[PDB]
Design an enzyme around this catalytic site. Sequence first.
Site, mmCIF file in Angstrom:
data_model
loop_
_atom_site.group_PDB
_atom_site.id
_atom_site.type_symbol
_atom_site.label_atom_id
_atom_site.label_comp_id
_atom_site.label_asym_id
_atom_site.label_seq_id
_atom_site.Cartn_x
_atom_site.Cartn_y
_atom_site.Cartn_z
ATOM 1 N N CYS A 50 0.375 -22.115 -30.423
ATOM 2 C CA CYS A 50 -0.280 -21.952 -31.475
ATOM 3 C C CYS A 50 0.217 -21.138 -32.118
ATOM 4 C CB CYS A 50 -1.625 -22.980 -31.495
ATOM 5 S SG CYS A 50 -1.344 -24.545 -31.167
ATOM 6 N N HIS B 109 -7.470 -18.770 -38.120
ATOM 7 C CA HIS B 109 -6.412 -19.347 -37.602
ATOM 8 C C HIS B 109 -7.421 -20.932 -37.519
ATOM 9 C CE1 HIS B 109 -3.962 -20.802 -34.410
ATOM 10 N NE2 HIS B 109 -4.718 -21.415 -33.175
ATOM 11 N N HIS C 116 -4.333 -29.102 -38.099
ATOM 12 C CA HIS C 116 -3.308 -27.994 -37.121
ATOM 13 C C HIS C 116 -1.978 -28.173 -36.652
ATOM 14 C CE1 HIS C 116 -2.491 -24.137 -34.930
ATOM 15 N NE2 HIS C 116 -2.342 -25.084 -33.732
HETATM 16 P P1 LIG Z 1 -12.744 -25.036 -21.805
HETATM 17 O O1 LIG Z 1 -14.649 -25.123 -22.048
HETATM 18 O O2 LIG Z 1 -12.151 -24.356 -21.987
HETATM 19 O O3 LIG Z 1 -12.573 -26.832 -22.691
HETATM 20 C C1 LIG Z 1 -11.185 -27.325 -22.718
HETATM 21 C C2 LIG Z 1 -11.245 -26.931 -24.352
HETATM 22 C C3 LIG Z 1 -9.717 -28.303 -24.211
HETATM 23 C C4 LIG Z 1 -12.294 -27.095 -25.246
HETATM 24 C C5 LIG Z 1 -10.737 -25.831 -24.677
HETATM 25 O O4 LIG Z 1 -11.844 -24.522 -24.711
HETATM 26 C C6 LIG Z 1 -10.084 -25.178 -25.994
HETATM 27 O O5 LIG Z 1 -10.261 -25.255 -26.917
HETATM 28 N N1 LIG Z 1 -9.146 -24.750 -25.756
HETATM 29 C C7 LIG Z 1 -8.528 -24.071 -27.577
HETATM 30 C C8 LIG Z 1 -9.618 -23.507 -28.160
HETATM 31 C C9 LIG Z 1 -8.676 -22.917 -29.376
HETATM 32 O O6 LIG Z 1 -8.846 -24.059 -30.683
HETATM 33 N N2 LIG Z 1 -7.517 -22.334 -29.428
HETATM 34 C C10 LIG Z 1 -7.074 -22.117 -30.262
HETATM 35 C C11 LIG Z 1 -5.323 -21.978 -30.007
HETATM 36 S S1 LIG Z 1 -5.030 -23.695 -30.068
#
Ligand SMILES: *P(=O)(O)OCC(C)(C)[C@H](O)C(=O)NCCC(=O)NCCS
Lengths: 80, 80, 412, 412
Positions: free
Chosen positions: C167, C304, C341
């Site tokens: 991303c 972001h 997004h």
């Molecule tokens: P875990 O507590 O790691 O939960 C998994 C998820 C899918 C929630 C993950 O941590 C997550 O949200 N990752 C991306 C967070 C985000 O918004 N990142 C920006 C790049 S897409």
Amino acid sequence: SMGYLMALFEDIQAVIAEQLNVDAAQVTPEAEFVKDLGADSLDVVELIMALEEKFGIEIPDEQAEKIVNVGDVVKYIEDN
Amino acid sequence: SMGYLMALFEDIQAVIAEQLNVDAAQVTPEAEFVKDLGADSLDVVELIMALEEKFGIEIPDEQAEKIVNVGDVVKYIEDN
Amino acid sequence: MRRIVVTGMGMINSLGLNKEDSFLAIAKGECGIKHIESFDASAFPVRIAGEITDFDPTEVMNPKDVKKAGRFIQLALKATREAMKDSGILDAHNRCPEELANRMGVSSGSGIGGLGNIEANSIFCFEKGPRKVNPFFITSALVNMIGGFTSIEFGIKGPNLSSVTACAAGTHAIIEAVKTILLNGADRMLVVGAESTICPVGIGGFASIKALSTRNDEPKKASRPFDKDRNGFVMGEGAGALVLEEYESAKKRGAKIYAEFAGYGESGDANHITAPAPEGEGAFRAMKMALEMAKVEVGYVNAHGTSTHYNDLYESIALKNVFGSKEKVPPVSSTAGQIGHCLGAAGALEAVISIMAMNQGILPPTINQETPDPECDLDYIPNAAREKQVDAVMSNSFGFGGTNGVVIFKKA
Amino acid sequence: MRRIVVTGMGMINSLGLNKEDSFLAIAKGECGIKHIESFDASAFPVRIAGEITDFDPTEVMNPKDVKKAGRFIQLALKATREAMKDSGILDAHNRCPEELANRMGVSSGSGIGGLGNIEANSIFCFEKGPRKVNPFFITSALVNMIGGFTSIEFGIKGPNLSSVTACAAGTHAIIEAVKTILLNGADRMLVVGAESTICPVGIGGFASIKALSTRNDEPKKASRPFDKDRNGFVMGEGAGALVLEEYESAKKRGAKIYAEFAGYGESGDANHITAPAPEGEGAFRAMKMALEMAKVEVGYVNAHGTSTHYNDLYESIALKNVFGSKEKVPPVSSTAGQIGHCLGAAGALEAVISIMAMNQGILPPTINQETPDPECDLDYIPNAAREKQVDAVMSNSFGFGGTNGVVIFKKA
Ligand SMILES: *P(=O)(O)OCC(C)(C)[C@H](O)C(=O)NCCC(=O)NCCS
Ligand SMILES: *P(=O)(O)OCC(C)(C)[C@H](O)C(=O)NCCC(=O)NCCS
């Protein structure tokens, strides 16, 4: 019966053991996935998927949210 | 039958025309794909596959290799 | 070092087919999220996406070559054609002048490229064997075919580079182009981030990790960066494109000058494969290194801000930390409420949006701000655009694997 | 400008699990090409590949994590561990020292990354619905997850970058790392190219465009770069890895110095999506640019040389034209006969191979030279390794989309 319950618990212990890469020693009914078994968001949801595969289940998404200790999963599979 | 043969010719012409954005005008028996229809190594191998897919057939690699004009392709399909 | 300006821009997304229509709708707080309809999602837990419903590939491609390009490449050709035309670089045959061609390259970004094409041909092969694999599969699917198809369409023969940092790919694609020009490897670069992954396995991949909003009963309120009731991102499709040009060469040409590149930062978290570093520490460092390199006053931050719990929270913490305090954070908005997004394309789209915001003194809002989050306490330009002139803008992108990229553009 | 050295190396391919075992077998002219056994290829027009049969993922990561990483990433974690240890940089915990972690990044390269994983989850989703898409799908498959897993494994927090320019990805990953150090974005860069695509949709994709050799009966004669009987490439899997450091940094900490980076060149053909430019025109410009930048006498060229009709011929034409005549071209070989063409990983593997050739004064051969091709009339070091000292080596990589990258390293 009690033996059936024991078999189910042992099967759950095996799956939780292989997924998180830990001994069947630490996976006790009072064991917490994140604190006691070294898991994370992605590991718990993947463990839940594997069980829905080892035990014909289809845990609805709301019940998976309230899962803190292995005991929660075992009792849900019991109520199956 | 002669009518069946003409129908097969029509179908092949339509396919070569679409896959190569060319009108049915240029799809003549003497039309070679690279000089007369504007094809390339990838377009030709792709034309031959949708022929096998639309006519439920299977051009062996040797005959496909010798294909130079629409006339040749149609004559091969007729010999089938 | 060498000076870099933006001399042409283009973008397509779920709120418009060009940068004027799209930015207007975005600044007005419109929302392009809708129900999915490009595949049958009726049995899916997530049924909403920023789909572009008015796009006709035959308007950018000969109808015969639509079959050779994944949908992300088709969107890239739409956006790059707009930016190239916008730049005034093209000759009478809509190609780069031959004596400029060797020194104009292309920097492309995408997260995964032709996923729907990989999925489709995987299924052909499994069900009916390798003879059902379409010959145009590979070259329709590879991420770098964005640069392949565009360099051929415009005749640009400089460095041909692709970034696949998830991303953050769109923003890293800008940075690689900047680095290339700074080191004398090109005088101009076409930059384009593009992504289109609204397909069964793409939606399934992100729902499997519980990253997508499940407000399928309300598509235009599902994406709500920094709001307390956010519950995951909404996947969008689109492409943004920029023409970057060394400054002296742009002025010689009579180019229009949208902005001047001022600084960038790149870092990795080295923490978790999907979650951000504690306190957004990697984001903090990337922002700090961009701000130290720009040496300007940033008056707007396109965050972001994907509308997950983690990013919005840790991005807000890192922003505070890098500017010093909540009051010292410039106006911040995430436009992911409006267009979803858009993954690998987000950084390119959001650089265009940021620069247009600068050009017209209009800062687009973060929409669907209904419930303040105590942990998300910045000024997010809630719900309605703010008329305010700014002299520099900063755009942030973070990706899976903990990779961060930040760029700042300044008025010129 | 700033000076850059190679201080650590590693590689894994179909002829060895380390760079020592691998290079020896390559210099002896052995061949790792075998019959596909990772999948049932019995119904396929192509049933051979450069498979690694001895690789154990549980040696580089703990058993729980193996399911989180595509095979190309498992291979990358092996090669980088070798290179990172080889470099002597790790602390007592096998991690980059904390005071150096912010200034050491990773530049990774792959053409498509976790294809088998996309293929598998695509089929899962198409047979059982989206709930059967494994949570670890996405981060197991994205190309930049090489830098994701490697940065977490070694705790390196500098720029985290990923190139995806098809079969030139591994060479571009080297160059982006160089650019980053030259611009003072880092003092050290882990570089790794990694590819593992021996799977049904992978083989079928290249078969359906007739790119692959169909000499199934003879896997050890199939790959024959520049030979008259060449009839397509043979797909190989592997990973190569380098540690780059700014020269003074490496000296201060007492580093092993394999080579100094000398020059690079990047270009695009803007001609065709799979076919090379006529006369290798784009390759010529990248090669000239690297030679003009290195300003050293190149004693050995590792050619792309994938065993295709166009590459070998148009690469041979470009080499003559850049060195002026066929008599002025230095000794050339392709090692793709030995290990297959490893696509996105090739550029990285062939930089390790080339530097080791220099280190050892042993130039590996092009194997399976049986019938001279009158149009491929260079010195291809046929069949037997040549003992010769060289002071500089050049490696070429070209990719679909017409993207070219060239690097030159010189003796320390
Ligand atoms: P875990 O507590 O790691 O939960 C998994 C998820 C899918 C929630 C993950 O941590 C997550 O949200 N990752 C991306 C967070 C985000 O918004 N990142 C920006 C790049 S897409
Ligand atoms: P056409 O003759 O272009 O047929 C398409 C094929 C598959 C032959 C394709 O162009 C090709 O094989 N090109 C060779 C170029 C090459 O080997 N490039 C290096 C990247 S693998």
